[PDB]
Scaffold this active site. Structure first.
Site, PDB file in Angstrom:
ATOM      1  N   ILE A  95      42.383 -19.620  10.627  1.00  0.00           N
ATOM      2  CA  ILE A  95      43.137 -19.630   9.355  1.00  0.00           C
ATOM      3  C   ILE A  95      44.454 -18.861   9.476  1.00  0.00           C
ATOM      4  CG2 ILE A  95      43.035 -19.366   6.842  1.00  0.00           C
ATOM      5  CD1 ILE A  95      40.100 -18.988   6.961  1.00  0.00           C
ATOM      6  N   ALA A 146      49.435 -10.158  10.414  1.00  0.00           N
ATOM      7  CA  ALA A 146      50.461  -9.231  10.879  1.00  0.00           C
ATOM      8  C   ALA A 146      50.277  -8.903  12.364  1.00  0.00           C
ATOM      9  CB  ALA A 146      50.435  -7.956  10.045  1.00  0.00           C
ATOM     10  N   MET A 186      45.426 -12.250  14.032  1.00  0.00           N
ATOM     11  CA  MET A 186      44.989 -13.610  13.821  1.00  0.00           C
ATOM     12  C   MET A 186      43.753 -13.583  12.932  1.00  0.00           C
ATOM     13  SD  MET A 186      42.619 -15.849  15.907  1.00  0.00           S
ATOM     14  CE  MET A 186      42.917 -17.147  17.102  1.00  0.00           C
ATOM     15  N   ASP A 244      54.323  -2.902  -2.081  1.00  0.00           N
ATOM     16  CA  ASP A 244      54.740  -4.202  -1.529  1.00  0.00           C
ATOM     17  C   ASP A 244      54.037  -5.312  -2.278  1.00  0.00           C
ATOM     18  OD1 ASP A 244      56.303  -5.817   0.141  1.00  0.00           O
ATOM     19  OD2 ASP A 244      54.845  -5.695   1.792  1.00  0.00           O
TER      20      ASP A 244
END
EC number: 2.7.11.24
Length: 347
Positions: A21, A25, A28, A139
């Protein structure tokens, strides 16, 4: 070891039947079958140990997510690593599987007003808990809001999060900043390090605008462009709001700009619910001191179908870093990561 598009994706006996999927960052992500709970889960392979910056973000996030427990915040279900520091090259973080996120959803789907209202409620419900722990996410954006098929929303990605520190928020004009440009509050470019709760409310107002139109409200192409997108819609700040900026360089930059009048929210969003726009206005307030706080936002009339403070929990105590992270070397952070993740070993 099992493999996926090599690389190694080896998640012990417990997690079988892998399906890729995308790339995160520091590695995987795959879905996998969890044989203890008999549900599919999401597993992120993280290989951060070659860079201090990756280690910092990884540690910060693990410490915060293990401490938090909230419906609208993604949990860590499990962490897989080698049994010794020497052998630990990677860490795998296991979390509830969420089918999509708001960034992907907004690429193709128009939201009903009901969907907007419910998603906003959940964002603010989660944010109340985060803020109640004296933590700033820093963020927030559509891609950090995970969604399942029944519209449950969970905030993720605490790699830039910090303990709030209003007394040390001040900085000079044009101070560089790491968090995603389009969701940055105007004061970031003027006089703020983003160490106050108001930074997050701005980001939520950006997200509400983006839900209403399917496009980012302030898509700056570079650092200072971000500020002139904001001023393009909010218009020139008031004298009162400028007087609050004591930083001469920041104040004089603002005074150098031609006068701009406010763009009415009902012009930008002619299809939107009027109460949504009133809340939007209060979140996207230029002066961070006048900006609505998370608990007020919850109580806003737009959210009256959901508001229930007794069912909007807070954290049992403030969050505190024992060690301040920015400082620490790569190898030291790796040691801290090992200790933080020890509870998931059979050991």
């Amino acid at each position: 070891a099992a493999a996926a598009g090599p690389q190694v994706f080896d998640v012990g006996p417990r997690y079988t039947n892998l399906s890729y999927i995308g790339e995160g960052a520091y590695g995987m992500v795959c879905s996998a079958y969890d044989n203890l709970n008999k549900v599919r889960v999401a597993i992120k392979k993280i290989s951060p140990f070659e860079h201090q910056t990756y280690c910092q973000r990884t540690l910060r996030e693990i410490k915060i997510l293990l401490r938090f427990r909230h419906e609208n915040i993604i949990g860590i279900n499990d962490i897989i690593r080698a049994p010794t520091i020497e052998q630990m090259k990677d860490v795998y973080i296991v979390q509830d599987l969420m089918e999509t996120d708001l960034y992907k959803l907004l690429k193709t789907q128009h939201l009903s007003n009901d969907h907007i209202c419910y998603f906003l409620y959940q964002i603010l419900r989660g944010l109340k808990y985060i803020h109640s722990a004296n933590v700033l996410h820093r963020d927030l954006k559509p891609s950090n809001l995970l969604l399942n098929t029944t519209c449950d929303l969970k905030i993720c990605d605490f790699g830039l999060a910090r303990v709030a520190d209003p007394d040390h928020d001040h900085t000079g004009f044009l101070t560089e900043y790491v968090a995603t440009r389009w969701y940055r509050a105007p004061e970031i470019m003027l006089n703020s390090k983003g160490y106050t709760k108001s930074i997050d409310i701005w980001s939520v107002g950006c997200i509400l605008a983006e839900m209403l139109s399917n496009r980012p409200i302030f898509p700056g192409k570079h650092y200072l462009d971000q500020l002139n997108h904001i001023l393009g819609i909010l218009g020139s700040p008031s004298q009162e709001d400028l007087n609050c900026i004591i930083n001469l360089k920041a104040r004089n930059y603002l005074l150098s700009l031609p006068h701009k009048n406010k763009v009415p929210w009902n012009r930008l969003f002619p299809n939107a619910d009027s109460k949504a726009l009133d809340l939007l206005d209060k979140m996207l307030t230029f002066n961070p001191h006048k900006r609505i706080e998370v608990e007020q936002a919850l109580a806003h009339p737009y959210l009256e179908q959901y508001y229930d403070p007794s069912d909007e929990p807070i954290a049992e105590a403030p969050f505190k870093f024992d060690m301040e992270l920015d400082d620490l070397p790569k190898e030291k952070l790796k040691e801290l990561i090992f200790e933080e993740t020890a509870r998931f070993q059979p050991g």
